[PDB]
Design an enzyme around this catalytic site. Structure first.
Site, PDB file in Angstrom:
ATOM      1  N   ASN A   1       6.151  -3.458  -9.908  1.00 47.79           N
ATOM      2  CA  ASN A   1       6.185  -3.264  -8.468  1.00 47.79           C
ATOM      3  C   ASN A   1       7.533  -3.005  -7.834  1.00 47.79           C
TER       4      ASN A   1
ATOM      5  N   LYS B   1      11.170   3.313 -10.552  1.00 55.25           N
ATOM      6  CA  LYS B   1      10.549   3.920 -11.747  1.00 55.25           C
ATOM      7  C   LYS B   1      10.756   5.458 -11.830  1.00 55.25           C
ATOM      8  N   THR B   2      10.420   6.096 -10.681  1.00 50.91           N
ATOM      9  CA  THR B   2      10.580   7.491 -10.472  1.00 50.91           C
ATOM     10  C   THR B   2      12.097   7.756 -10.525  1.00 50.91           C
ATOM     11  N   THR B   3      12.865   6.916  -9.814  1.00 50.44           N
ATOM     12  CA  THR B   3      14.304   7.056  -9.855  1.00 50.44           C
ATOM     13  C   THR B   3      14.870   7.066 -11.251  1.00 50.44           C
TER      14      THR B   3
ATOM     15  N   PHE C   1      -4.433  15.254  -1.140  1.00 48.59           N
ATOM     16  CA  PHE C   1      -5.208  14.403  -2.000  1.00 48.59           C
ATOM     17  C   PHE C   1      -5.668  13.209  -1.204  1.00 48.59           C
TER      18      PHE C   1
ATOM     19  N   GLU D   1       3.924   9.478 -11.943  1.00 47.37           N
ATOM     20  CA  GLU D   1       2.821   8.746 -11.381  1.00 47.37           C
ATOM     21  C   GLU D   1       1.462   8.986 -11.945  1.00 47.37           C
TER      22      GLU D   1
ATOM     23  N   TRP E   1      -7.679  10.214  -2.116  1.00 51.18           N
ATOM     24  CA  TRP E   1      -7.707   8.893  -2.711  1.00 51.18           C
ATOM     25  C   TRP E   1      -9.054   8.335  -2.307  1.00 51.18           C
TER      26      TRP E   1
ATOM     27  N   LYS F   1      11.069  -1.119  -6.931  1.00 53.56           N
ATOM     28  CA  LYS F   1      11.543   0.246  -6.679  1.00 53.56           C
ATOM     29  C   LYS F   1      12.347   0.734  -7.858  1.00 53.56           C
TER      30      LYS F   1
ATOM     31  N   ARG G   1      20.336  13.024 -16.832  1.00 55.53           N
ATOM     32  CA  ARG G   1      21.166  12.764 -17.949  1.00 55.53           C
ATOM     33  C   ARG G   1      20.913  13.840 -18.981  1.00 55.53           C
TER      34      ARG G   1
HETATM   35  C1  B12 Z   1       2.285   1.282  -4.267  1.00 61.45           C
HETATM   36  C2  B12 Z   1       1.813   2.045  -3.057  1.00 61.45           C
HETATM   37  C3  B12 Z   1       0.704   2.856  -3.190  1.00 61.45           C
HETATM   38  C4  B12 Z   1      -0.300   2.769  -4.300  1.00 61.45           C
HETATM   39  C5  B12 Z   1      -1.174   1.544  -3.995  1.00 61.45           C
HETATM   40  C6  B12 Z   1      -2.068   0.977  -5.145  1.00 61.45           C
HETATM   41  C7  B12 Z   1      -1.270   0.239  -6.194  1.00 61.45           C
HETATM   42  N1  B12 Z   1      -0.494  -0.796  -5.808  1.00 61.45           N
HETATM   43  O1  B12 Z   1      -1.417   0.534  -7.404  1.00 61.45           O
HETATM   44  C8  B12 Z   1      -0.942   4.136  -4.211  1.00 61.45           C
HETATM   45  C9  B12 Z   1      -0.197   5.128  -5.093  1.00 61.45           C
HETATM   46  C10 B12 Z   1      -2.482   4.251  -4.458  1.00 61.45           C
HETATM   47  C11 B12 Z   1      -0.645   4.556  -2.831  1.00 61.45           C
HETATM   48  C12 B12 Z   1      -1.118   5.733  -2.363  1.00 61.45           C
HETATM   49  C13 B12 Z   1      -0.792   6.200  -1.120  1.00 61.45           C
HETATM   50  N2  B12 Z   1       0.214   5.804  -0.382  1.00 61.45           N
HETATM   51 CO1  B12 Z   1       1.314   4.323  -0.769  1.00 61.45          CO
HETATM   52  N3  B12 Z   1       2.388   2.844  -0.937  1.00 61.45           N
HETATM   53  C14 B12 Z   1       2.725   2.171  -1.990  1.00 61.45           C
HETATM   54  C15 B12 Z   1       3.724   1.137  -1.642  1.00 61.45           C
HETATM   55  C16 B12 Z   1       4.978   1.456  -2.447  1.00 61.45           C
HETATM   56  C17 B12 Z   1       3.335  -0.306  -1.879  1.00 61.45           C
HETATM   57  C18 B12 Z   1       2.202  -0.883  -1.080  1.00 61.45           C
HETATM   58  C19 B12 Z   1       2.007  -2.309  -1.472  1.00 61.45           C
HETATM   59  O2  B12 Z   1       1.784  -2.559  -2.686  1.00 61.45           O
HETATM   60  N4  B12 Z   1       2.236  -3.223  -0.520  1.00 61.45           N
HETATM   61  C20 B12 Z   1       2.142  -4.682  -0.680  1.00 61.45           C
HETATM   62  C21 B12 Z   1       0.702  -5.185  -0.675  1.00 61.45           C
HETATM   63  C22 B12 Z   1       0.661  -6.697  -1.010  1.00 61.45           C
HETATM   64  O3  B12 Z   1       0.241  -5.101   0.725  1.00 61.45           O
HETATM   65  P1  B12 Z   1      -1.082  -4.323   1.103  1.00 61.45           P
HETATM   66  O4  B12 Z   1      -1.001  -4.177   2.588  1.00 61.45           O
HETATM   67  O5  B12 Z   1      -2.300  -5.013   0.549  1.00 61.45           O
HETATM   68  O6  B12 Z   1      -0.864  -2.937   0.384  1.00 61.45           O
HETATM   69  C23 B12 Z   1      -1.953  -1.998   0.258  1.00 61.45           C
HETATM   70  C24 B12 Z   1      -1.692  -0.736   1.040  1.00 61.45           C
HETATM   71  O7  B12 Z   1      -0.267  -0.430   1.018  1.00 61.45           O
HETATM   72  C25 B12 Z   1      -2.506   0.290   0.151  1.00 61.45           C
HETATM   73  N5  B12 Z   1      -2.014   1.681   0.236  1.00 61.45           N
HETATM   74  C26 B12 Z   1      -0.959   2.161  -0.445  1.00 61.45           C
HETATM   75  N6  B12 Z   1      -0.313   3.165   0.174  1.00 61.45           N
HETATM   76  C27 B12 Z   1      -1.071   3.373   1.342  1.00 61.45           C
HETATM   77  C28 B12 Z   1      -0.888   4.313   2.391  1.00 61.45           C
HETATM   78  C29 B12 Z   1      -1.813   4.314   3.410  1.00 61.45           C
HETATM   79  C30 B12 Z   1      -1.635   5.343   4.539  1.00 61.45           C
HETATM   80  C31 B12 Z   1      -2.873   3.404   3.469  1.00 61.45           C
HETATM   81  C32 B12 Z   1      -3.825   3.404   4.638  1.00 61.45           C
HETATM   82  C33 B12 Z   1      -3.081   2.485   2.428  1.00 61.45           C
HETATM   83  C34 B12 Z   1      -2.161   2.530   1.387  1.00 61.45           C
HETATM   84  O8  B12 Z   1      -2.237  -0.136  -1.172  1.00 61.45           O
HETATM   85  C35 B12 Z   1      -2.031  -1.574  -1.186  1.00 61.45           C
HETATM   86  C36 B12 Z   1      -3.250  -2.194  -1.904  1.00 61.45           C
HETATM   87  O9  B12 Z   1      -4.495  -2.081  -1.105  1.00 61.45           O
HETATM   88  C37 B12 Z   1       3.959   1.375  -0.155  1.00 61.45           C
HETATM   89  C38 B12 Z   1       5.389   1.259   0.236  1.00 61.45           C
HETATM   90  C39 B12 Z   1       5.588   0.409   1.498  1.00 61.45           C
HETATM   91  N7  B12 Z   1       6.821   0.431   2.001  1.00 61.45           N
HETATM   92  O10 B12 Z   1       4.646  -0.218   1.953  1.00 61.45           O
HETATM   93  C40 B12 Z   1       3.451   2.777   0.017  1.00 61.45           C
HETATM   94  C41 B12 Z   1       2.876   3.268   1.349  1.00 61.45           C
HETATM   95  C42 B12 Z   1       2.026   2.170   1.979  1.00 61.45           C
HETATM   96  N8  B12 Z   1       2.035   4.415   0.915  1.00 61.45           N
HETATM   97  C43 B12 Z   1       2.289   5.493   1.614  1.00 61.45           C
HETATM   98  C44 B12 Z   1       1.572   6.707   1.440  1.00 61.45           C
HETATM   99  C45 B12 Z   1       1.841   7.799   2.510  1.00 61.45           C
HETATM  100  C46 B12 Z   1       0.502   6.762   0.635  1.00 61.45           C
HETATM  101  C47 B12 Z   1      -0.299   8.015   0.276  1.00 61.45           C
HETATM  102  C48 B12 Z   1      -0.737   8.893   1.474  1.00 61.45           C
HETATM  103  C49 B12 Z   1       0.602   8.800  -0.731  1.00 61.45           C
HETATM  104  C50 B12 Z   1       0.207  10.265  -0.824  1.00 61.45           C
HETATM  105  N9  B12 Z   1       1.138  11.131  -0.484  1.00 61.45           N
HETATM  106  O11 B12 Z   1      -0.919  10.594  -1.191  1.00 61.45           O
HETATM  107  C51 B12 Z   1      -1.485   7.378  -0.506  1.00 61.45           C
HETATM  108  C52 B12 Z   1      -2.681   6.977   0.350  1.00 61.45           C
HETATM  109  C53 B12 Z   1      -3.546   5.815  -0.103  1.00 61.45           C
HETATM  110  C54 B12 Z   1      -4.242   5.241   1.049  1.00 61.45           C
HETATM  111  N10 B12 Z   1      -4.819   4.027   0.941  1.00 61.45           N
HETATM  112  O12 B12 Z   1      -4.286   5.827   2.129  1.00 61.45           O
HETATM  113  C55 B12 Z   1       3.080   5.204   2.843  1.00 61.45           C
HETATM  114  C56 B12 Z   1       2.188   5.155   4.100  1.00 61.45           C
HETATM  115  C57 B12 Z   1       2.824   5.756   5.371  1.00 61.45           C
HETATM  116  C58 B12 Z   1       2.215   5.280   6.679  1.00 61.45           C
HETATM  117  N11 B12 Z   1       2.999   5.147   7.732  1.00 61.45           N
HETATM  118  O13 B12 Z   1       0.982   5.071   6.765  1.00 61.45           O
HETATM  119  C59 B12 Z   1       3.899   3.976   2.407  1.00 61.45           C
HETATM  120  C60 B12 Z   1       4.313   3.035   3.542  1.00 61.45           C
HETATM  121  C61 B12 Z   1       5.122   4.488   1.669  1.00 61.45           C
HETATM  122  C62 B12 Z   1       6.031   5.337   2.500  1.00 61.45           C
HETATM  123  N12 B12 Z   1       5.979   6.649   2.228  1.00 61.45           N
HETATM  124  O14 B12 Z   1       6.721   4.878   3.413  1.00 61.45           O
HETATM  125  N13 B12 Z   1       0.463   3.921  -2.418  1.00 61.45           N
HETATM  126  N1  LIG Z   2       8.477  -2.638  -4.011  1.00 54.22           N
HETATM  127  C1  LIG Z   2       8.486  -1.693  -3.043  1.00 54.22           C
HETATM  128  N2  LIG Z   2       8.420  -1.959  -1.707  1.00 54.22           N
HETATM  129  C2  LIG Z   2       8.447  -0.913  -0.804  1.00 54.22           C
HETATM  130  N3  LIG Z   2       8.535   0.380  -1.021  1.00 54.22           N
HETATM  131  C3  LIG Z   2       8.580   0.611  -2.351  1.00 54.22           C
HETATM  132  C4  LIG Z   2       8.594  -0.319  -3.364  1.00 54.22           C
HETATM  133  N4  LIG Z   2       8.699   0.301  -4.594  1.00 54.22           N
HETATM  134  C5  LIG Z   2       8.765   1.595  -4.312  1.00 54.22           C
HETATM  135  N5  LIG Z   2       8.721   1.816  -2.976  1.00 54.22           N
HETATM  136  C6  LIG Z   2       8.809   3.052  -2.290  1.00 54.22           C
HETATM  137  O1  LIG Z   2       7.484   3.510  -2.216  1.00 54.22           O
HETATM  138  C7  LIG Z   2       7.445   4.902  -2.477  1.00 54.22           C
HETATM  139  C8  LIG Z   2       6.603   5.080  -3.709  1.00 54.22           C
HETATM  140  O2  LIG Z   2       7.366   4.533  -4.785  1.00 54.22           O
HETATM  141  P1  LIG Z   2       6.680   4.021  -6.114  1.00 54.22           P
HETATM  142  O3  LIG Z   2       5.602   3.079  -5.674  1.00 54.22           O
HETATM  143  O4  LIG Z   2       6.190   5.130  -6.959  1.00 54.22           O
HETATM  144  O5  LIG Z   2       7.971   3.339  -6.664  1.00 54.22           O
HETATM  145  P2  LIG Z   2       9.240   3.844  -7.522  1.00 54.22           P
HETATM  146  O6  LIG Z   2       8.857   4.958  -8.410  1.00 54.22           O
HETATM  147  O7  LIG Z   2       9.838   2.701  -8.261  1.00 54.22           O
HETATM  148  O8  LIG Z   2      10.196   4.255  -6.346  1.00 54.22           O
HETATM  149  P3  LIG Z   2      11.479   5.096  -6.332  1.00 54.22           P
HETATM  150  O9  LIG Z   2      10.955   6.485  -6.411  1.00 54.22           O
HETATM  151  O10 LIG Z   2      12.444   4.812  -5.188  1.00 54.22           O
HETATM  152  O11 LIG Z   2      12.202   4.869  -7.568  1.00 54.22           O
HETATM  153  C9  LIG Z   2       8.914   5.252  -2.584  1.00 54.22           C
HETATM  154  O12 LIG Z   2       9.384   5.721  -1.302  1.00 54.22           O
HETATM  155  C10 LIG Z   2       9.480   4.155  -3.034  1.00 54.22           C
HETATM  156  O13 LIG Z   2      10.893   4.139  -2.883  1.00 54.22           O
HETATM  157 MG   LIG Z   3       7.516   6.633  -8.083  1.00 57.60          MG
END
Ligand code: B12
Ligand SMILES: Nc1ncnc2c1ncn2[C@@H]1O[C@H](COP(=O)(O)OP(=O)(O)OP(=O)(O)O)[C@@H](O)[C@H]1O
Ligand SMILES: [Mg+2]
Ligand SMILES: Nc1ncnc2c1ncn2[C@@H]1O[C@H](COP(=O)(O)OP(=O)(O)OP(=O)(O)O)[C@@H](O)[C@H]1O
Ligand SMILES: [Mg+2]
EC number: 2.5.1.17
Lengths: 169, 190
Positions: free
Chosen positions: A10, A14-16, A64, A101, A66, A12, A24
């Site tokens: 979890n 991996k991609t980096t 895409f 990814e 999802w 940050k 490299r």
């Molecule tokens: C890892 C992650 C994912 C994973 C989540 C599953 C997993 N853990 O294996 C995957 C790759 C599926 C996912 C996909 C997407 N994600 Co993402 N995700 C991230 C990330 C890095 C972590 C979220 C998390 O684990 N939070 C902690 C847990 C404990 O809290 P949670 O509230 O239960 O988290 C849930 C939601 O975050 C949900 N989810 C993940 N991403 C998103 C985005 C949206 C719009 C929604 C509604 C739900 C959703 O996944 C978690 C499990 O249910 C965040 C980064 C961040 N800064 O939040 C971005 C983030 C939430 N995702 C982002 C984006 C845009 C998306 C995608 C649209 C990516 C894309 N281009 O297709 C999709 C949409 C999925 C969706 N539900 O709509 C944005 C959303 C922007 C916004 N203002 O709404 C964020 C904030 C990253 C960023 N770019 O700033 N993501």
């Molecule tokens: N633990 C985290 N909390 C919040 N945002 C995260 C976290 N890990 C990664 N991100 C950010 O969420 C987006 C998706 O990253 P991803 O979940 O694939 O992680 P990552 O590959 O380790 O990120 P990065 O590309 O910076 O190396 C990136 O903008 C990334 O920097």
């Molecule tokens: Mg990545």
């Protein structure tokens, strides 16, 4: 002798890390190809920098969902990227392939495990594959030669820091 | 159902909450492979957007610097460590000198408002082995430009540093080709 490298967990980075290895390698006159399974909203800095050097990039089509219903569309698209991926894993002039990814692709049934697998196994003896993403299939993890867990000890966003260009995307 | 919105609302809110924006400290630690490589990928990502970056490397490798090769020309300065560093107690003066030397430049980048990013590669062993004073690092980090991001790398990072750091990821070696007899290689290992 190429290996399989997996960047998962979890935190940050991996991609980096995949990119830094790629860089490299580019810095060693090496040939690399990248497939990204996810479509960023933002502009792609790694791409911006490496594409010009000779790095091929195949990205996922935009929109895409999802989403469950949409899984068919969503799949085709995946399957469409996976092709280039197939191609690169069969290219002998490619020293390295980045499969960004993939994890979620396998995980949600979008990309069949066996596909990846076979594709991996059958790759050039000298080719290195780097796979990244949260939750990587146990099979993959096992086939893998190196694997690293990005343990989330701390994360800026938790402290209220906005995602910003240059660091996050 | 409503679960969907539920999450939707969560994200939106979290996102809605994190408005701050400045340069951060990032640490890449642990024994697993990927510390230096992720710093460089981030650097690379930065450059890819026009951002300005500076790098300092505390250790001088056996082979050529692929990253340097690739990144210098983009205007990424590299301040690397002199050949022949001993890890010998006997020679701490020479090694320390060397250290402190690389440290100047770093101090310099840390002070430059032009740099959006500073990479202190393998700094941990410099502090951990007393070849470089922590308060220094702690201070410098403290002074640096407020939009400047630092990324520190290496195993066994001082808590204090860990504590100051904004994001920290510890690379856990699930697996490693080496243990499996794979030898180090070009583009991969170095
Ligand atoms: C890892 C992650 C994912 C994973 C989540 C599953 C997993 N853990 O294996 C995957 C790759 C599926 C996912 C996909 C997407 N994600 Co993402 N995700 C991230 C990330 C890095 C972590 C979220 C998390 O684990 N939070 C902690 C847990 C404990 O809290 P949670 O509230 O239960 O988290 C849930 C939601 O975050 C949900 N989810 C993940 N991403 C998103 C985005 C949206 C719009 C929604 C509604 C739900 C959703 O996944 C978690 C499990 O249910 C965040 C980064 C961040 N800064 O939040 C971005 C983030 C939430 N995702 C982002 C984006 C845009 C998306 C995608 C649209 C990516 C894309 N281009 O297709 C999709 C949409 C999925 C969706 N539900 O709509 C944005 C959303 C922007 C916004 N203002 O709404 C964020 C904030 C990253 C960023 N770019 O700033 N993501
Ligand atoms: N633990 C985290 N909390 C919040 N945002 C995260 C976290 N890990 C990664 N991100 C950010 O969420 C987006 C998706 O990253 P991803 O979940 O694939 O992680 P990552 O590959 O380790 O990120 P990065 O590309 O910076 O190396 C990136 O903008 C990334 O920097
Ligand atoms: Mg990545
Ligand atoms: N756990 C490990 N086992 C074997 N070799 C490793 C391991 N971790 C890193 N290496 C290799 O040691 C050298 C640098 O080690 P370091 O402690 O700085 O880790 P790193 O920053 O994560 O590595 P890298 O530069 O590959 O990303 C590299 O050749 C590196 O790939
Ligand atoms: Mg290193």
């Amino acid at each position: 002798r190429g290996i399989i490298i997996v960047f998962t967990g979890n935190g940050k980075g991996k991609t980096t890390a995949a990119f830094g290895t790629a860089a490299r390698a580019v810095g060693h006159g090496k040939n690399v190809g990248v497939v990204q399974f996810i479509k960023g909203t933002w502009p792609n800095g790694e791409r911006n920098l490496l594409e010009p050097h000779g790095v091929e990039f195949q990205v996922m089509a935009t929109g895409f969902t999802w989403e469950t219903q949409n899984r068919e569309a969503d799949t085709a698209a995946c399957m469409a990227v996976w092709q280039h991926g197939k191609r690169m894993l069969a290219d002998p002039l490619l020293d390295m392939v980045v499969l960004d990814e993939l994890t979620y692709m396998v995980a949600y049934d979008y990309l069949p495990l066996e596909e990846v697998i076979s594709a991996l196994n059958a790759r050039p003896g000298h080719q290195t594959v780097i796979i990244t993403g949260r939750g990587c299939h146990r099979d993959i993890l096992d086939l893998a030669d190196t694997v690293s867990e990005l343990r989330p000890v701390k994360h800026a966003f938790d402290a209220g820091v906005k995602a910003q260009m240059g660091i996050d995307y």
